[PDB]
Design an enzyme around this catalytic site. Structure first.
Site, PDB file in Angstrom:
ATOM      1  N   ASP F  37       0.842  -1.186   0.000  1.00  0.00           N
ATOM      2  CA  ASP F  37       0.000   0.000   0.000  1.00  0.00           C
ATOM      3  C   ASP F  37       0.885   1.246   0.000  1.00  0.00           C
ATOM      4  OD1 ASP F  37       0.842  -0.849   2.471  1.00  0.00           O
ATOM      5  OD2 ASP F  37      -0.874  -0.013   3.552  1.00  0.00           O
TER       6      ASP F  37
HETATM    7  P1  ZMP Z   1      -1.554   4.636   2.149  1.00  0.00           P
HETATM    8  O1  ZMP Z   1      -2.527   4.489   1.005  1.00  0.00           O
HETATM    9  O2  ZMP Z   1      -1.442   3.410   3.034  1.00  0.00           O
HETATM   10  O3  ZMP Z   1      -2.065   5.855   3.064  1.00  0.00           O
HETATM   11  C1  ZMP Z   1      -1.923   7.199   2.541  1.00  0.00           C
HETATM   12  C2  ZMP Z   1      -2.770   8.142   3.384  1.00  0.00           C
HETATM   13  C3  ZMP Z   1      -2.214   8.169   4.810  1.00  0.00           C
HETATM   14  C4  ZMP Z   1      -2.678   9.550   2.787  1.00  0.00           C
HETATM   15  C5  ZMP Z   1      -4.231   7.676   3.407  1.00  0.00           C
HETATM   16  O4  ZMP Z   1      -4.498   6.824   2.306  1.00  0.00           O
HETATM   17  C6  ZMP Z   1      -5.280   8.775   3.470  1.00  0.00           C
HETATM   18  O5  ZMP Z   1      -6.025   8.959   2.511  1.00  0.00           O
HETATM   19  N1  ZMP Z   1      -5.380   9.464   4.597  1.00  0.00           N
HETATM   20  C7  ZMP Z   1      -6.319  10.563   4.771  1.00  0.00           C
HETATM   21  C8  ZMP Z   1      -5.640  11.861   5.130  1.00  0.00           C
HETATM   22  C9  ZMP Z   1      -4.456  11.693   6.057  1.00  0.00           C
HETATM   23  O6  ZMP Z   1      -3.452  11.099   5.687  1.00  0.00           O
HETATM   24  N2  ZMP Z   1      -4.516  12.258   7.264  1.00  0.00           N
HETATM   25  C10 ZMP Z   1      -3.425  13.059   7.799  1.00  0.00           C
HETATM   26  C11 ZMP Z   1      -2.753  12.387   8.967  1.00  0.00           C
HETATM   27  S1  ZMP Z   1      -1.192  13.181   9.424  1.00  0.00           S
HETATM   28  C12 ZMP Z   1      -0.793  12.290  10.888  1.00  0.00           C
HETATM   29  O7  ZMP Z   1      -1.382  11.299  11.240  1.00  0.00           O
HETATM   30  C13 ZMP Z   1       0.357  12.875  11.646  1.00  0.00           C
HETATM   31  C14 ZMP Z   1       0.697  12.109  12.881  1.00  0.00           C
HETATM   32  C15 ZMP Z   1       2.177  12.165  13.224  1.00  0.00           C
HETATM   33  C16 ZMP Z   1       2.559  11.325  14.411  1.00  0.00           C
HETATM   34  C17 ZMP Z   1       4.006  10.919  14.440  1.00  0.00           C
HETATM   35  C18 ZMP Z   1       4.382  10.091  15.632  1.00  0.00           C
HETATM   36  C19 ZMP Z   1       4.051  10.740  16.946  1.00  0.00           C
HETATM   37  C20 ZMP Z   1       5.121  11.641  17.504  1.00  0.00           C
HETATM   38  C21 ZMP Z   1       6.054  10.971  18.486  1.00  0.00           C
HETATM   39  C22 ZMP Z   1       7.119  10.106  17.855  1.00  0.00           C
HETATM   40  C23 ZMP Z   1       7.756   9.111  18.795  1.00  0.00           C
HETATM   41  C24 ZMP Z   1       8.350   9.702  20.047  1.00  0.00           C
HETATM   42  C25 ZMP Z   1       9.519  10.621  19.795  1.00  0.00           C
END
Ligand code: ZMP
Ligand code: PC1
Ligand code: PC1
Ligand code: 3PE
Ligand code: 3PE
Ligand code: 3PE
Ligand code: 3PE
Ligand code: SF4
Ligand code: SF4
Lengths: 60, 39, 122, 185, 49, 80, 332, 334, 77
Positions: F37
């Site tokens: 994916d």
């Molecule tokens: P693929 O097809 O598998 O997936 C692609 C995506 C993800 C784009 C999806 O298909 C999708 O359509 N998603 C819808 C929109 C989306 O992606 N949403 C945005 C989310 S951004 C997000 O989740 C940011 C989170 C970051 C967290 C990082 C880790 C936490 C911080 C601490 C780190 C460890 C300690 C230091």
């Protein structure tokens, strides 16, 4: 009654800057003072070393 | 002048031979010492 | 960039194509930084374990279908990334992110009805 | 920057003066530089202070001044008969800005409205006097005492026994402080 | 305090809350004492949320 | 080159998200053929970047979607 | 909520509680009695001197000048006695409240303030003997932490951080509050916008504060110190124990509190560290819907990068001290 | 001779070294009390009668405190710097004459001995900052080393002017040569420069960045705990007293005043002590009176003000000596 | 026994006589703490010297509100 000012009113108090000049820190007498000590010291040093020089003559 | 008289400033004063010494040596004799009067 | 090390100016995404690039860009920076994160906070876990947590964090929001919500999540990710890569977080903050290091465990909810009932609502 | 209307008279500074135009002689200028005249004057000020009386008091043999309004350790008071002044109105518990007071109450065996619990968390209390201001019977007061530092934090959780004992010990101060300031309350 | 984004802001980050703090405390739905608290744990030899 | 491919198998075969090993080819695609994916693909390019010790730009990484595309991309980069 | 304001700029307690009282008085739509206005103005300038004694001298102590800090903190001790005489606290007086002040001043306070006033000018002068002309002090402050008049306004600088750059602006002059329209004083303004100009403005503010305090001692009128409506201010204890109406109003003010008409206001004063403001939203109830505090130190520290970039690390202590920075103000 | 040489050397060393450390201990007590009187306060008055035991309480507290060394960089190297600084700070007392020839070592090269042992003491400060394994504290110890060597040039340039007058490096001969006049009068600018250099040489205020905690980058001495603090502090007070003694020797006539051997010796010791104590008082007086100079300004003061004047005086003074036929004799006399 | 009490008295006299706090002056309590070094009370008269670093210090005075954001720093010092 209540805490009130005196009937006449409190007298004026000093608040404006007061750092008056004094002669102990004016530079002209200080410069004159320093020059006299140096002049007196060199007068005594000429007389001192000349005497010390004559003592070496006697010792030799 | 800028300074108010030491004789009107609500602080312990010097006396006798010591007041004359103070007026002869300090930078400004009208300057108080900040000690409040107990009476 | 200009204000401080990992500072990203707040901008909206123009379209869903724009948003997807940022999300993949954000994930790429996160899992790339995982080796540095381990040695920088002396995390007692392998980079594999840390990188799994990164994916799950991105998978909680995989189903979002709203562009404005994505912009909010992207801004949060950049803020968390900056405060991690700059040594602004402390080991307590990053360690708290790993749910295993709580003295009551990680399975902090009952497995089923009867275990929670026998213990007293978990 | 300046207020609306015409520029304030003489707001604009005159042009800077060149070295040539300075109204101060070279000998004075050179003398102050090499002799450090203003630094010598500052040192002379310290000698003047060296011969002035110090402000230090020898605590705990001497104490600094406090007023009848001074807010220190809490106490519960009695009437001259010895009955508790407190009638469990809960005014002090309601006004308390820090939620430091906890009270429980019922009818006493004689049917009097009295407290069963009166606690003050001295590690929550901000020493503001609001309880003492709100009390309609002068039951809760702050004593002038400030020297009650403790070994453990649990010693600062005052219950009703601790507070009534404090009032018994400090009552002559409590009455004197009330006597002096009650006209202003 | 409120979670409001300012587009065009350079370096929009927290200024008051602790690093890794979750929630926006000046929201009416955010409770007064919040959700978590810290202490020093003598096994981990560090502070724990 | 051929030395890059033998290193490519060393990580894709070790990847736990492959649908079935030995499905790798000289031109296999991560999505269509290998069943990866979006994010699993992001991780694979990051693992290749580590092997050749060369950072890959995000635009260049988007271009990389097949085993051949990576083999071609690493050769162009001077570092290895 | 009033005691929460003592603990923001916690060397400037009475003016901190002054700004919250004025904002609440504005939404209450009440005019406080003249004696309260003069007491609050008088304690305002006493609190400004307390703050400048802390600010200027601890700033002097940071760059190496140990002695003025010792001399001036005895002056702090004398003025802290006045705070303890009126309230029962050295610092957190909770004295200025909406409606006026908590209680009246004791009958011997004005004369005791006057006695301290006759000697305070000498204390200012002896401080200026060690710093103003001292070439080490000048070389540490002149040309350091320069901000232009234009940028100071755009950076949200207020107070001395603004007046040091040549802008003549004082909230006490532009929007008068309490009794500052009834007193005479001058506003020190710098011209080079540097740490040395801001030091000279603060030293002159010492003298204008003393000048205001002397006027307040002589202009102090007779009358009540709390607005005379027991629906807002608590009744005198003798009234509360005597008549039904007073006892009810005492009960309600200490359990429910007074209701404040709905609306919002931004109210600002010239605090010792600059423009302090508070933004209050009232919903008509006895609890405020929203209280936001505008701290001058917050805006000043936000400008630290602008005033320090390109300059020497050895000048950072000078500009940290030139900003009057207490972090209870900054963080709240 | 009359008794054993070893006994004499024991007693002579004990008579100089032991009362010296007593005097160094009470200079720290006197510093606190002098600044206090100047600050309208008392200073130590509770540890011992009149505060006379305060320095002994401080020393014992630190000597029983636990030391926190670096991350096992080296045991020897960590203590090596503190040990060097203390030993060579105290070694200069061995040529001080408490009367004509009344020194542990009556050395003809004594002035050069004092310069050498001071140069060897700067090593300990520099070797400490590096050993701390903190690049922040190293830069402060580096700045402190730069200030010490630069003002060492000021002191040895000033001292060269005194040697031209007396024609000798013997501390005794320098003092005897002042029966004619104390050198502070003929060499008045030199005395002022030398005193300023001695304050800078001792990392004392207004030249006190080494211990300044309010300055953001300063305070190298502020990270020294337990025994290491005792080493550095004792070395500093020991150098302060020795820079005041050497200043009195060179410019205030040394042990000279303004029949029994015991009283003649006592008066010579007392006269040197009175002069040294006055300069210790001034030394404390300047710390309380002035703010602190920035590192860039204090280096510019040394290299663009003091040294250009001294090198100008190095030209003028021998020309005056030759023009007045007052070049002294360099043989053993006095 | 008497000897060991004597050293006990001696070592304790030194701990009391040179009482060096590291003032973690978090907020307004630091103002009252700062007033202990001023002329009226002059803690130096009793041997109290404030120290900037924990390395030189025997006592920690926590004078102020400890926030969660600040607690790791307090534990470190
Ligand atoms: P693929 O097809 O598998 O997936 C692609 C995506 C993800 C784009 C999806 O298909 C999708 O359509 N998603 C819808 C929109 C989306 O992606 N949403 C945005 C989310 S951004 C997000 O989740 C940011 C989170 C970051 C967290 C990082 C880790 C936490 C911080 C601490 C780190 C460890 C300690 C230091
Ligand atoms: C050591 C080198 C001493 C060189 C010459 C020092 C001259 C000044 C002597 C000061 C000490 C005098 C005795 C003293 O005050 O001790 C009080 C001490 C008590 O110290 P204290 O701290 O409890 O003093 C209490 C008095 N107040 C608190 C009000 C200031 O009493 C003793 O126990 C003395 C017996 C042992 C003495 C050990 C030190 C002797 C030093 C001289 C020998
Ligand atoms: C250099 C290394 C560091 C300095 C080491 C030597 C220091 C000089 C001698 C100091 C000796 C300790 C002070 C004198 C004893 C003392 O504390 O008196 C008060 C003690 C009590 O000290 P205290 O601490 O209980 O008194 C408290 C005082 N206030 C209330 C102000 C806090 O007197 C006694 O009751 C016991 C006396 C015991 C016997 C005397 C011991 C003398 C030891 C001399 C050793 C000399 C070597
Ligand atoms: C000793 C303490 C003296 C205190 C009294 C004093 O201040 O004397 C100052 C003296 C007279 O000045 P005066 O007239 O008092 O000041 C103007 C007042 N309207 O003013 C003087 O003339 C004294 C100052 C000059 C002294 C010259 C002799 C000493 C020179 C030393 C040079 C040092 C260089 C470094
Ligand atoms: C660092 C400081 C460096 C700067 C120093 C600044 C001051 C320098 C001043 C130099 C003055 C030298 C002293 C003049 C002098 O003392 O001359 C003495 C000499 C007579 O003295 P003499 O005969 O030896 O014995 C005393 C008799 N009753 O008289 C003579 O016979 C010769 C006099 C010649 C005068 C030349 C000009 C002098 C000015
Ligand atoms: C280093 C130790 C300190 C050395 C400096 C202290 C001695 C300073 C002597 C006075 C300097 C100036 C002398 C002079 O003649 O000044 C006149 C001239 C300008 O005249 P002006 O005073 O400005 O007119 C009045 C305007 N209001 O100004 C000028 O044109 C400059 C003339 C300079 C001539 C200097 C000659 C004396 C040199 C003394 C050396 C001392 C050596 C011993 C140490
Ligand atoms: C014991 C007996 C009494 C001892 C008195 C000691 C007096 C206190 C000594 C404390 C230490 C000295 C403080 C010096 C302060 C300082 O360094 O100021 C730096 C100053 C900067 O001047 P500059 O860089 O040349 O440029 C000027 C144009 N703005 O540069 C200067 O100001 C230099 C001016 C002073 C020169 C003094 C040396 C010459 C002495 C007479 C010859
Ligand atoms: S102390 Fe006073 S206010 Fe509180 S419950 Fe008792 S009577 Fe009511
Ligand atoms: S003093 Fe103030 S905080 Fe403390 S119990 Fe009384 S009302 Fe509550």
């Amino acid at each position: 009654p209540q805490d009130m000012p005196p009937p006449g009113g409190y007298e004026a108090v000093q608040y404006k800057r007061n750092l008056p000049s004094r002669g102990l820190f004016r530079p002209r007498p200080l410069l004159a003072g320093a020059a006299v000590l140096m002049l007196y010291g060199w007068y005594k040093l000429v007389k001192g070393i000349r005497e010390q020089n004559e003592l070496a003559r006697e010792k030799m | 002048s800028n300074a108010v008289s030491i004789t009107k400033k609500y602080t312990v004063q010097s006396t006798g031979i010591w007041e004359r010494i103070r007026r002869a040596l300090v930078i400004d004799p009208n300057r108080s010492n900040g000690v409040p009067l107990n009476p | 960039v200009q204000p401080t090390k990992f500072a990203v100016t707040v901008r909206q995404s123009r379209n869903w194509a724009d948003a997807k690039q940022r999300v993949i860009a954000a994930y790429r920076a996160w899992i790339r930084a995982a080796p540095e994160i381990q040695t920088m906070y002396s995390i007692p876990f392998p980079v594999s374990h840390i990188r799994t947590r990164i994916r799950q964090e991105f998978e909680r929001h995989r189903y979002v279908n709203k562009l404005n919500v994505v912009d909010v999540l992207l801004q949060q990710s950049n803020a968390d990334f900056q405060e991690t890569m700059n040594f602004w977080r402390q080991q307590s903050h990053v360690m708290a992110f790993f749910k295993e290091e709580h003295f009551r465990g990680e399975k902090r909810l009952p497995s089923n009805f009867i275990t929670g009932f026998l213990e007293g609502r978990n | 920057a300046t207020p609306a209307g015409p520029p304030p008279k003489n707001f604009r500074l005159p042009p800077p003066k060149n070295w040539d135009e300075e109204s101060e002689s070279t000998i004075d200028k050179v003398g102050k530089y090499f002799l450090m005249t203003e630094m010598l004057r500052g040192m002379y000020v310290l000698l003047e202070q060296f011969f002035r009386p110090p402000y230090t008091i020898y605590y705990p043999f001497e104490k600094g001044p406090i007023s009848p309004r001074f807010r220190g350790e809490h106490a519960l008071r009695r009437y001259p008969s010895g009955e508790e002044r407190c009638i469990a109105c809960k005014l002090c518990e309601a006004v308390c800005p820090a939620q430091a007071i906890t009270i429980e109450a019922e009818e006493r065996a004689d049917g009097s409205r009295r407290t069963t619990r009166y606690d003050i968390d001295m590690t929550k209390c901000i020493y503001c006097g609001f309880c003492q201001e709100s009390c309609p019977v002068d039951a809760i007061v702050e004593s002038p005492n400030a020297e009650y530092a403790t070994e453990t934090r649990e010693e600062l959780l005052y219950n009703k026994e601790k507070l009534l004992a404090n009032g018994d010990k400090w009552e002559p101060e409590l009455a004197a402080a009330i006597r002096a300031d009650a006209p202003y309350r | 305090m409120f979670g409001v984004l300012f587009v065009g802001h350079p370096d929009l980050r927290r200024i008051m809350t602790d690093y890794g703090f979750e929630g926006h405390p000046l929201r009416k739905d955010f409770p007064l004492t919040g959700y978590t608290e810290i202490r020093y744990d003598e096994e981990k030899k560090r502070i724990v949320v | 080159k051929v030395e890059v491919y033998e290193r490519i198998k060393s990580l894709l075969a070790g990847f736990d998200k492959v649908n079935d090993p030995n499905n790798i080819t000289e031109t296999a695609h991560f999505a269509n053929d290998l069943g990866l994916d979006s994010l699993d693909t992001v991780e694979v390019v990051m693992a290749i970047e580590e092997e050749f010790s060369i950072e890959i730009p995000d635009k260049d990484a988007d271009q990389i979607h097949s085993v051949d595309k990576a083999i071609e991309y690493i050769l162009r980069q001077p570092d290895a | 909520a009033l005691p929460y304001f003592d603990r923001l700029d916690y060397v400037s307690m009475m003016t901190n509680e002054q700004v919250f009282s004025l904002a609440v008085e504005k939404l209450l739509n009440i005019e406080i009695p003249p004696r309260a206005k003069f007491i609050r103005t008088m304690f305002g300038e006493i609190t400004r001197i307390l703050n400048h004694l802390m600010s200027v001298l601890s700033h002097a102590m940071d760059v190496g000048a140990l002695t003025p800090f010792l001399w001036g903190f005895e002056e702090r001790e004398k003025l802290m006695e006045f705070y303890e005489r009126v309230s029962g606290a050295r610092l957190h007086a909770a004295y200025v409240r909406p409606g006026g002040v908590h209680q009246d001043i004791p009958v011997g306070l004005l004369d005791d303030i006057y006695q301290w006033a006759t000697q305070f000018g000498d204390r200012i002068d002896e401080t200026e003997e060690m710093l103003t002309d001292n070439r080490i002090w000048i070389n540490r402050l002149k040309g350091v932490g320069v901000v232009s008049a234009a940028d100071a306004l755009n950076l949200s600088f207020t107070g001395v951080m603004l007046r040091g750059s040549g802008v003549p602006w004082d909230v006490r002059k532009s929007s008068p509050y309490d009794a500052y329209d009834q007193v005479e004083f001058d506003v020190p303004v710098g011209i080079n916008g540097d740490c040395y100009d801001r030091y000279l403005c603060r030293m002159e503010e010492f003298r204008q504060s003393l000048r205001i305090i002397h006027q307040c001692l002589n202009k102090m009128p007779a009358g009540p110190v709390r607005y005379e409506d027991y629906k807002i201010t608590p009744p005198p204890r003798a009234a509360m124990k005597e008549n039904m109406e007073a006892l009810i109003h005492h009960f309600l003010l200490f359990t429910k509190g007074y209701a404040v008409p709905p609306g919002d206001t931004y109210t600002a004063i010239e605090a010792p560290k600059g423009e302090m403001g508070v933004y209050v939203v009232s919903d008509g109830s006895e609890r405020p819907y929203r209280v936001h505090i505008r701290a001058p130190g917050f805006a000043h520290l936000s400008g630290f990068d602008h005033i320090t970039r390109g300059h020497l690390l050895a000048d950072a202590v000078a500009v940290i001290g030139t900003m009057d920075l207490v972090f209870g103000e900054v963080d709240r | 001779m009359s008794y054993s040489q070893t006994i004499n050397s024991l007693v002579e060393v004990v008579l100089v070294l032991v009362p010296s450390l007593v005097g160094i201990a009470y200079v720290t007590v006197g510093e606190r009390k002098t600044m206090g009187s100047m600050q309208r306060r008392l200073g130590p008055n509770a540890v011992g009668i009149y505060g006379l035991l305060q320095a002994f309480a401080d020393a014992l507290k630190l000597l029983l405190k636990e030391y926190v060394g670096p991350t096992q960089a080296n045991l020897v190297l960590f203590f090596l710097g503190p040990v060097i600084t203390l030993i060579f700070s105290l070694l200069g007392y061995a040529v001080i004459p408490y009367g004509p020839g009344l020194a542990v070592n009556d050395l003809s090269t004594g002035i050069l001995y004092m310069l050498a042992v001071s140069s060897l003491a700067t090593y300990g400060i520099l070797l400490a900052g590096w050993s701390a394994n903190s690049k922040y504290a190293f830069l402060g110890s580096l700045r402190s080393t730069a200030q010490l060597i630069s003002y060492e040039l000021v002191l040895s340039s000033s001292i060269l002017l005194v040697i031209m007058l007396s024609g000798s490096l013997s501390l005794t001969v320098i003092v005897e040569s002042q029966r004619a006049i104390w050198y502070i009068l003929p060499l008045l600018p030199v005395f002022i420069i030398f005193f300023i250099g001695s304050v800078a040489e001792t990392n004392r205020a207004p030249f006190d960045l080494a211990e300044a905690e309010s300055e953001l980058v300063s305070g190298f001495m502020t990270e020294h705990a337990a025994v290491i603090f005792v080493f550095f502090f004792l070395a500093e007070y020991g150098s302060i007293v020795l820079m005041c003694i050497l200043t009195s020797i060179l410019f205030l006539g040394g042990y000279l005043l303004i029949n029994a051997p015991t009283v003649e010796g006592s008066f010579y010791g007392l006269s040197l002590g009175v002069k040294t104590s006055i300069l210790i008082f001034v030394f404390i007086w300047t710390r309380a009176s002035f703010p602190r100079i920035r590192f860039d300004q204090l280096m510019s003061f040394c290299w663009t003000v003091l040294l250009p004047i001294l090198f100008a005086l190095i030209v003028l003074v021998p020309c005056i000596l030759y023009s007045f036929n007052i070049f002294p004799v360099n043989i053993s006399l006095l | 026994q008497y000897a060991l009490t004597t050293l006990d008295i001696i070592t304790n006299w030194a701990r009391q006589g040179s009482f060096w706090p590291m003032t973690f002056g978090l907020a307004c309590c630091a103002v009252e703490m700062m007033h202990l070094s001023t002329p009226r009370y002059d803690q130096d008269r009793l041997g109290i010297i404030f120290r900037a670093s924990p390395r030189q210090s025997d006592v920690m005075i926590v004078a102020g509100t400890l926030t969660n954001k600040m607690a790791p720093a307090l534990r470190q010092v």
